Design a protein around this nucleic acid. Sequence first.
RNA 1: AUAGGUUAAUGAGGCGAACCGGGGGAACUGAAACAUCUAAGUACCCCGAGGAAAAGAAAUCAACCGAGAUUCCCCCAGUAGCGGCGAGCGAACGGGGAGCAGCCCAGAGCCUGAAUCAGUGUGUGUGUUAGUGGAAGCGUCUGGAAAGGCGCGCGAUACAGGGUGACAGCCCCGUACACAAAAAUGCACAUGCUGUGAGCUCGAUGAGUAGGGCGGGACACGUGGUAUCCUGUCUGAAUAUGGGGGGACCAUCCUCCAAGGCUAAAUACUCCUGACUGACCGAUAGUGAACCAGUACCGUGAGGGAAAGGCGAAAAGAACCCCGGCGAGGGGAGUGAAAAAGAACCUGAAACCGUGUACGUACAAGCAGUGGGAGCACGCUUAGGCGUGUGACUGCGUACCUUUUGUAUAAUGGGUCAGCGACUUAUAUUCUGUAGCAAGGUUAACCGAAUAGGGGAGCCGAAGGGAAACCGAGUCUUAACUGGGCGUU
Lengths: 50, 20, 64, 143
Amino acid sequence: ELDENLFLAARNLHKVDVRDATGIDPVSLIAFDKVVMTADAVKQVEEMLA
Amino acid sequence: HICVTSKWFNIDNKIVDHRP
Amino acid sequence: PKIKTVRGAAKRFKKTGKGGFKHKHANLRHILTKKATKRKRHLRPKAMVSKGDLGLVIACLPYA
Amino acid sequence: RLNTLSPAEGSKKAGKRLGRGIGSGLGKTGGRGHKGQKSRSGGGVRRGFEGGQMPLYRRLPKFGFTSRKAAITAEIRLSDLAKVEGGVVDLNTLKAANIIGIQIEFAKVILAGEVTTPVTVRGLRVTKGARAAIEAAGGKIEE
RNA sequence: AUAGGUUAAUGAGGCGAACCGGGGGAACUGAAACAUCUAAGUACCCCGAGGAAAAGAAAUCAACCGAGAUUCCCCCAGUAGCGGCGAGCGAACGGGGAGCAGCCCAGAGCCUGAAUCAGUGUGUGUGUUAGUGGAAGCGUCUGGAAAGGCGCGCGAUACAGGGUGACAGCCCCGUACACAAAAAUGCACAUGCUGUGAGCUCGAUGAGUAGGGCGGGACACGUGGUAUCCUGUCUGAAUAUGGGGGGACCAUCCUCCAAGGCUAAAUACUCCUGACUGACCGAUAGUGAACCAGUACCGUGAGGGAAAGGCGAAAAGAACCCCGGCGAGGGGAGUGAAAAAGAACCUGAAACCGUGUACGUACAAGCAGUGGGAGCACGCUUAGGCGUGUGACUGCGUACCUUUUGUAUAAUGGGUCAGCGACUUAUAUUCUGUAGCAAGGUUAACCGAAUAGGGGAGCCGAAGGGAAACCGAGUCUUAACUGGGCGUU
Ligand SMILES: N[C@@H](Cc1c[nH]c2ccccc12)C(=O)O
Ligand SMILES: N[C@@H](Cc1c[nH]c2ccccc12)C(=O)O
Ligand SMILES: [Mg+2]
Ligand SMILES: [Mg+2]
Ligand SMILES: [Mg+2]
Ligand SMILES: [Mg+2]
Ligand SMILES: [Mg+2]
Ligand SMILES: [Mg+2]
Ligand SMILES: [Mg+2]
Ligand SMILES: [Mg+2]
Ligand SMILES: [Mg+2]
Ligand SMILES: [Mg+2]
Ligand SMILES: [Mg+2]
Ligand SMILES: [Mg+2]
Ligand SMILES: [Mg+2]
Ligand SMILES: [Mg+2]
Ligand SMILES: [Mg+2]
Ligand SMILES: [Mg+2]
Ligand SMILES: [Mg+2]
Ligand SMILES: [Mg+2]
Ligand SMILES: [Mg+2]
Ligand SMILES: [Mg+2]
Ligand SMILES: [Mg+2]
Ligand SMILES: [Mg+2]
């Protein structure tokens, strides 16, 4: 669901970004070396894609 | 230079009718 | 801008099933009395536009 | 991995450029040929034009007449109606199932095959073959 | 009594990029000619206004079910229609969206200044016009110079960006973030002052108008069977039991109330202010103008209209000496990483012009090269008819482009170099490839947690035949097909 602190940290870390569940775009998935994703987000995506 | 004025005429002029 | 149908052609051809076009024969609008009944008779039923003119008609009726 | 993707082979044809040298194959003249109206910027002749000859779409007579009533009659396939939602296939209703279109005021039912769930059709017309198929599937056709 | 005249108080006048409304309004061009038609109510001239303009509260659509001002967007659809039925022009009904708002006058009585609007003073809040604070880096290597490499630390709600002797989160200026207004102001409210009318009862309901005749013009609609709208001209009603419209026209039905006005938003535009962005240009590009450019220059004038950027990190911009005319220019010296960066200054290509060396060349005839090929000079190798340069002599041999039946052509074009210089972009449509899904496929505007998700209005396809009514795996043709045409795979 995305929180204040997790976002403000990483704003300045260059190789790391943080997105909410809806913010998932194709280039990013491929962009970063590792995609983390909370198990909570997984269920969101699970449905968004059907 | 300052050097830049060309008002080149019209051909030049005299003669020619070259049989018709 | 959308192509405009060549409006005149629209009023002389109708796309058929398989993608043909069918038209009314010429030569049947006046000065008839001197033409054989057989000839005039054969000019009533519509007919398909030939293979050679297909090119033209299609270019006239993009939205056929 | 963002430089290891590549498109399906033969999905991106290069596309004529022309006017760039002998080798290219489309140099100098650029596949336009020598002279004439068809070369030249903005060349070409209009559609239907066939030299000054009287064009086909003018030699031949007009024969129109547009029904205008036809414009508000739809046709219904048997394949529909099952998807009508409520087992009553009505003057509209189909309309609501997005299989007719508001402006429509008439409709036939047409043997376009395949009806299963019993259905009653009301206020429509229906072909000899369609009636039979409906009825033979437990359907009812009241006017 | 007017006109006339003096004074006075107010306001106007001129300029200005576009957007907007209005008065006028072309031709090139297209039709492969040209009159109708097109270009087009465009270009241009004119008048006027606002922050937006205009439009607007049905004498509107619908079709017997209903909707409910105007404006804008996507559909409807290049459809219906218009049309020397040519070229072309091109709706509406209905549907999905943006935004939504409704009020006065045609009037007198009572009650009276009561709603409201503008102009204005104050207050308040909120933006604006200066500002404040703002984290954390050192060691060493190369070097003229470290921000670079390597090592080890540190800040980060700050790794936007610029600068600094080469590429800096921690040198500087910032950035995130948190703060600030003495004064003047935009915007909201709250009131004071001015001007304004609110409210109830009972009334009223837009005539030289509607319509018609003549002539034009507008409506997609060219007079056409042409409704509808506007009016230059001549006419001219009904008035609610009345009147308008429903595309000739009549009946019935239905629906609306013209001949007075106002009205916010969704819409348009950018002379100009601020901030931010770019698969935009980088000095023949990009503004005409990176430069003291609308300049120099040209023109009586309207008006036209250039060229031209870079020393270095820092001027440390060359004290002094020598030749020379107390010259020009030069050589030393000195500065600097570099002077071959010396101001005619980063890089310094090409045409073009010289000095030096090797080889050839003064008995030889032509697209000047090419195949052969000695000698010479030079390197080789250990020789070994090998590399490089030149090229006696010799076989063959008439440049390039274009245009043409055909060109060495005495047919075109080019004095040479360098830079620039010509199949693009948008939207439709169809085919091929490719991808998704599949009898289904896909959404448009718009909403938006903004490349997602929503939105299926709609478009294409699954059914065809017939001008059409209509019929339907058939249908059309005909009284009817032994049939036939188009379709059914
Ligand atoms: N001699 C002129 C030809 C010419 C004849 N009459 C003239 C008059 C005006 C100019 C030129 C001409 C030429 O070189 O072309
Ligand atoms: N044609 C004549 C005379 C002439 C001279 N110049 C001319 C120019 C135009 C016409 C004619 C002329 C000649 O050349 O002898
Ligand atoms: Mg006839
Ligand atoms: Mg040519
Ligand atoms: Mg030719
Ligand atoms: Mg040709
Ligand atoms: Mg629908
Ligand atoms: Mg013409
Ligand atoms: Mg009603
Ligand atoms: Mg400060
Ligand atoms: Mg700081
Ligand atoms: Mg009225
Ligand atoms: Mg108004
Ligand atoms: Mg320039
Ligand atoms: Mg340069
Ligand atoms: Mg230099
Ligand atoms: Mg000799
Ligand atoms: Mg000679
Ligand atoms: Mg000889
Ligand atoms: Mg010839
Ligand atoms: Mg030839
Ligand atoms: Mg030859
Ligand atoms: Mg010669
Ligand atoms: Mg020549």
